[PDB]
Amino acid sequence: SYQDEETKKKTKEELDKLMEPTLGVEAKIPRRNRALFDKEGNRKATPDTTDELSEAQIMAIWNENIDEIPHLKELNDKTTSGLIYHSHDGKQEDKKRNLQYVRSGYVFDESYSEIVKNKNGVPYIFKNGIDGYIYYLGTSPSKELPKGNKVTYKGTWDFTSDVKTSYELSGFSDAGNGKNVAATSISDNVNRDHKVGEKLGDNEVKGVAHSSEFAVDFDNKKLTGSLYRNGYINRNKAQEVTKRYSIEADITGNRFRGKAKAEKAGDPIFTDSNYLEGGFYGPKAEEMAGKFFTNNKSLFAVFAAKSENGETTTERIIDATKIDLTQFNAKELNNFGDASVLIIDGQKIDLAGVNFKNSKTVEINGKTMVAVACCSNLEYMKFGQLWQKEGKQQVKDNSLFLQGERTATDKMPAGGNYKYVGTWDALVSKGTNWIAEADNNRESGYRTEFDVNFSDKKVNGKLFDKGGVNPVFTVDATINGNGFIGSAKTSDSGFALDSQHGNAVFSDIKVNGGFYGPTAGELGGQFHHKSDNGSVGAVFGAKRQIE
């Protein structure tokens, strides 16, 4: 007489667009249209006085290969200057930025002329000078976070303003002072080529270009930081280091959301922002990157920083795995801390639905992807099938997936004995293919049952075929932290996939699992093995019972 425990449904977040998480973000550097005529060939009463930044110009990017600098190839193909630069190109001190998981800053053509003429051959667009982008892009959104009240990250920041002919800014070169081309971290008159510590005359170099520092309090899910401008330095001129911004943010999943506070009153472009969002990258949050957009739309800024290493104790926050049903091997998936969305090519596929398990079909061109996600009673995890389909109906890239939001380790129950029941998906292949399909038939379906003993840290599991007397697979595992690890097997006898060949006999199969939700009220895990022959790919989930 068991029954799912009652749980207060997960509280659903509705984020402003700018606050949605992505692998990266970019924006084009604004350039004033200097043309004297409009597209219909009539004289503008007034040549444009502005070129605005807007939320529609701030674009999500999602390239998996961070070696491919965004737009670098495009800029090279169209350039007539041959002057292509980017913030990681290593050609000056300020462009030597040693990050492993993140790229950020800018990529641009120093001098590029766009002239567009209409049918009548009248020029209605004329822009010139710097052409490029401000961006950040990260890879491997972190699945584990360091423990502690203060972890320091150091790095850079970069920016572009909007354009207004009324701007009278100081500290920027004629290449970008806001009148014809945006003021950017490219045109700012800062120290670019003298390393920290050097002395020019008796002037010590304190900093390079635009530097950032953050103090992350992982235990309290918060962080603060500072962004600095490090002025040009001579033997004739001591360096002026000024703080432009203070930052505060709160951490959710592997992301953070907050504000940037302008530190200098009365600046027409360096103003406050309520729209700061970024994330941790690297398996252990070795690095961080993000962006903000000022409230008066005067400025788009990005930043990136890394911690000194670790060799740090971490606590896992996320599981998101894909198991291939042909190689029976596993690979990581991008996830930001929401197990109910699948992220593909920057598109978020919502996995929830009205049914116990729900199928989703989405053209993420050019691939028609379909995912079957379970289950409606699992609030902090999902698992299911995922494949590309072509035709009516051949199938391609067939696989399994599992995602979960780990229970905090200090919220793991301290004892003792509880029951967990759920279902699973799997594929055992030796000769013929034997599948398991998730369902809600607690009686005689593809059942999963776990005895969990928090006292002596043990998980024991049974996984059944439909109309199954004894289990097809059992699991013996050990609870360590907020997850478990152990072995899946079958009886010493093995089990019939069908007479012509022996039962599938499996032993010492490596199984990884997690505890999910506020108080470990859900568990899930996977295993896979490739043998010639006798192979298997399986994912499973279950909910804690009461009574």
CATH number of the CATH domain containing 61: 2.40.128.250
- In DSSP terms, which residues pair with 22 in a beta bridge? none
Residue 184, SS3 per DSSP: strand
List Cβ<8 Å contacts ≥24 apart for 433-441: 434/497, 434/504, 436/463, 436/465, 436/472, 436/538, 438/357, 438/372, 438/374, 438/375, 438/383, 438/384, 439/356, 439/357, 439/466, 440/356, 440/375, 441/466
Q: Which of 507, 499, 424 is nearest to 465 (CA)?
A: 424
Q: Which of 446, 520, 435, 452 is nearest to 486 (CA)?
A: 452
The DSSP 8-state label assigned to residue 321 in this structure reads E
Q: How many domains does the chain have?
A: 4
- Looking at the fold, whether 526 and 452 belong to one and the same domain comes out as yes
> Which residue, chain included where needed, has tokens 């103003």?
271
Query: 61-96 burial, b for 16+ CB within 10 Å, e for fewer?
Result: bebeebeebbbbeebeeeeeeeebbbbbeeeebbbe
Give the helix/strand (H/E) hosting 385.
Answer: strand 381-390
Burial class (CB in 10 A: 0-12, 13-18, 19+), 425: buried
Residue type for position 387: W
- Looking at the fold, whether 306 and 232 belong to one and the same domain comes out as yes
- Looking at the fold, whether 208 and 313 belong to one and the same domain comes out as yes
| Residue 129 tokens, joined | 């000078």
| Concatenated DSSP letters of 269-301 | SS--EEEEEEEEESTT--EEEEEEE-TTS-EEE
Query: Could you check whether the bond before residue 393 is cis, i.e. omega within 30 degrees of 0?
Result: yes
- φ, ψ of residue 176 to 5 degrees: the values are 180, 85
Residue 190, SS3 per DSSP: strand
Nearest-angstrom CA–CA distance, 273 and 234: 34
- Looking at the fold, whether 425 and 547 belong to one and the same domain comes out as yes
Nearest-angstrom CA–CA distance, 139 and 213: 21
In angstroms, the Cα distances linking 430 to 74, 248, 494, 536 are: 49, 55, 12, 9
- φ, ψ of residue 74 to 5 degrees: the values are -55, -50
Q: Which of 306, 537, 304, 273 is nearest to 424 (CA)?
A: 537
Last residue of a domain, one of 140, 174, 206: 140
- Looking at the fold, whether 323 and 260 belong to one and the same domain comes out as no
Last residue of a domain, one of 367, 384, 406: 406
Give the helix/strand (H/E) hosting 347.
Answer: strand 347-350
- φ, ψ of residue 422 to 5 degrees: the values are -160, -150
- Can you say whether the dihedral through the CA atoms of 527, 374, 514, 461 is positive or negative? negative
The answer to whether the beta carbons of residues 513 and 477 sit under 8 Å apart is: yes
CATH of the domain at 453: 2.40.160.90
The DSSP 8-state label assigned to residue 330 in this structure reads E
- Looking at the fold, whether 102 and 56 belong to one and the same domain comes out as yes
- Can you say whether the dihedral through the CA atoms of 194, 200, 204, 209 is positive or negative? negative
- Looking at the fold, whether 334 and 297 belong to one and the same domain comes out as no
Nearest-angstrom CA–CA distance, 177 and 157: 18
Residue type for position 534: G
- Which structural domain range is residue 356 located in? 318-406
- Looking at the fold, whether 348 and 442 belong to one and the same domain comes out as no
Nearest-angstrom CA–CA distance, 522 and 429: 29
Residue type for position 244: R
Nearest-angstrom CA–CA distance, 173 and 183: 8
Nearest-angstrom CA–CA distance, 379 and 357: 13
Angle at 527 between CA 524 and CA 529, to 5 degrees: 170
Count Cα neighbours of 36 within 13 Å in the Cβ-side half-sphere.
1
Q: Is residue 11 part of a domain?
A: no
Alpha helices, H only, 104-237? none
What contacts 291, CB < 8 A, 6 or more positions away? 25, 58, 136, 276, 277, 278, 300, 301, 302, 303
Nearest-angstrom CA–CA distance, 512 and 509: 10
10 CB neighbour count, 10 Å cutoff: 14
For β-strands 367-374 and 483-489, DSSP reports them as unpaired
Nearest-angstrom CA–CA distance, 2 and 392: 42
Burial class (CB in 10 A: 0-12, 13-18, 19+), 480: exposed
- Looking at the fold, whether 285 and 166 belong to one and the same domain comes out as yes
- Looking at the fold, whether 450 and 476 belong to one and the same domain comes out as yes
